[PDB]
PDB file of all heavy atoms in Angstrom:
ATOM      1  N   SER A   8     106.583 127.994 125.167  1.00  0.00           N
ATOM      2  CA  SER A   8     107.854 127.593 124.576  1.00  0.00           C
ATOM      3  C   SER A   8     108.862 127.140 125.556  1.00  0.00           C
ATOM      4  O   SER A   8     109.311 127.838 126.505  1.00  0.00           O
ATOM      5  CB  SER A   8     108.486 128.937 123.883  1.00  0.00           C
ATOM      6  OG  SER A   8     108.882 129.822 124.855  1.00  0.00           O
ATOM      7  N   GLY A   9     109.146 125.860 125.422  1.00  0.00           N
ATOM      8  CA  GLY A   9     110.062 125.164 126.387  1.00  0.00           C
ATOM      9  C   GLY A   9     110.966 124.030 125.688  1.00  0.00           C
ATOM     10  O   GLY A   9     111.850 124.355 124.949  1.00  0.00           O
ATOM     11  N   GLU A  10     110.649 122.832 126.024  1.00  0.00           N
ATOM     12  CA  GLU A  10     111.293 121.672 125.497  1.00  0.00           C
ATOM     13  C   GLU A  10     110.371 120.429 125.614  1.00  0.00           C
ATOM     14  O   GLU A  10     109.651 120.375 126.437  1.00  0.00           O
ATOM     15  CB  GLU A  10     112.612 121.522 126.205  1.00  0.00           C
ATOM     16  CG  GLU A  10     113.651 120.813 125.308  1.00  0.00           C
ATOM     17  CD  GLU A  10     115.092 120.926 125.908  1.00  0.00           C
ATOM     18  OE1 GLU A  10     115.230 120.984 127.162  1.00  0.00           O
ATOM     19  OE2 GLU A  10     115.998 120.888 125.155  1.00  0.00           O
ATOM     20  N   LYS A  11     110.782 119.445 124.731  1.00  0.00           N
ATOM     21  CA  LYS A  11     110.065 118.266 124.764  1.00  0.00           C
ATOM     22  C   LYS A  11     110.418 117.393 125.924  1.00  0.00           C
ATOM     23  O   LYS A  11     109.807 116.328 126.142  1.00  0.00           O
ATOM     24  CB  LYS A  11     110.315 117.333 123.454  1.00  0.00           C
ATOM     25  CG  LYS A  11     109.275 116.343 123.088  1.00  0.00           C
ATOM     26  CD  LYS A  11     108.157 116.849 122.257  1.00  0.00           C
ATOM     27  CE  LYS A  11     107.248 117.720 123.035  1.00  0.00           C
ATOM     28  NZ  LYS A  11     107.698 119.213 122.973  1.00  0.00           N
ATOM     29  N   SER A  12     111.366 117.912 126.750  1.00  0.00           N
ATOM     30  CA  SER A  12     111.790 117.156 127.985  1.00  0.00           C
ATOM     31  C   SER A  12     111.289 117.904 129.207  1.00  0.00           C
ATOM     32  O   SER A  12     111.320 119.138 129.260  1.00  0.00           O
ATOM     33  CB  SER A  12     113.260 117.056 128.012  1.00  0.00           C
ATOM     34  OG  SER A  12     113.701 116.330 129.160  1.00  0.00           O
ATOM     35  N   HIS A  13     110.795 117.266 130.168  1.00  0.00           N
ATOM     36  CA  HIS A  13     110.375 117.776 131.421  1.00  0.00           C
ATOM     37  C   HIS A  13     111.481 118.519 132.183  1.00  0.00           C
ATOM     38  O   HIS A  13     112.574 117.901 132.479  1.00  0.00           O
ATOM     39  CB  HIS A  13     109.730 116.675 132.349  1.00  0.00           C
ATOM     40  CG  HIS A  13     108.828 115.809 131.637  1.00  0.00           C
ATOM     41  ND1 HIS A  13     107.401 115.979 131.548  1.00  0.00           N
ATOM     42  CD2 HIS A  13     108.930 114.642 130.991  1.00  0.00           C
ATOM     43  CE1 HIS A  13     106.841 115.037 130.888  1.00  0.00           C
ATOM     44  NE2 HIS A  13     107.732 114.178 130.500  1.00  0.00           N
ATOM     45  N   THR A  14     111.282 119.736 132.469  1.00  0.00           N
ATOM     46  CA  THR A  14     112.310 120.490 133.198  1.00  0.00           C
ATOM     47  C   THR A  14     111.742 120.907 134.538  1.00  0.00           C
ATOM     48  O   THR A  14     110.656 121.342 134.777  1.00  0.00           O
ATOM     49  CB  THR A  14     112.640 121.858 132.413  1.00  0.00           C
ATOM     50  OG1 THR A  14     113.231 121.515 131.124  1.00  0.00           O
ATOM     51  CG2 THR A  14     113.552 122.746 133.258  1.00  0.00           C
ATOM     52  N   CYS A  15     112.704 120.766 135.610  1.00  0.00           N
ATOM     53  CA  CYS A  15     112.304 121.081 136.965  1.00  0.00           C
ATOM     54  C   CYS A  15     112.381 122.690 137.155  1.00  0.00           C
ATOM     55  O   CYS A  15     113.381 123.327 137.035  1.00  0.00           O
ATOM     56  CB  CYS A  15     113.334 120.408 137.893  1.00  0.00           C
ATOM     57  SG  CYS A  15     112.776 120.503 139.692  1.00  0.00           S
ATOM     58  N   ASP A  16     111.056 123.110 137.469  1.00  0.00           N
ATOM     59  CA  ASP A  16     111.002 124.610 137.719  1.00  0.00           C
ATOM     60  C   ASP A  16     111.637 125.002 139.020  1.00  0.00           C
ATOM     61  O   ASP A  16     111.874 126.123 139.285  1.00  0.00           O
ATOM     62  CB  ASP A  16     109.528 124.969 137.705  1.00  0.00           C
ATOM     63  CG  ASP A  16     109.071 125.346 136.313  1.00  0.00           C
ATOM     64  OD1 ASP A  16     109.672 124.883 135.316  1.00  0.00           O
ATOM     65  OD2 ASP A  16     108.138 126.196 136.188  1.00  0.00           O
ATOM     66  N   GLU A  17     111.920 123.981 139.876  1.00  0.00           N
ATOM     67  CA  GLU A  17     112.564 124.257 141.177  1.00  0.00           C
ATOM     68  C   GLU A  17     114.033 124.660 140.988  1.00  0.00           C
ATOM     69  O   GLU A  17     114.482 125.644 141.682  1.00  0.00           O
ATOM     70  CB  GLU A  17     112.480 123.069 142.081  1.00  0.00           C
ATOM     71  CG  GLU A  17     111.098 122.475 142.171  1.00  0.00           C
ATOM     72  CD  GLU A  17     110.216 123.171 143.169  1.00  0.00           C
ATOM     73  OE1 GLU A  17     110.829 123.622 144.200  1.00  0.00           O
ATOM     74  OE2 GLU A  17     108.970 123.257 142.919  1.00  0.00           O
TER      75      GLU A  17
END
Side-chain angles (χ1 to χ4, degrees):
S8 68
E10 204 165 30
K11 199 90 287 90
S12 184
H13 312 266
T14 296
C15 190
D16 270 25
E17 308 277 327

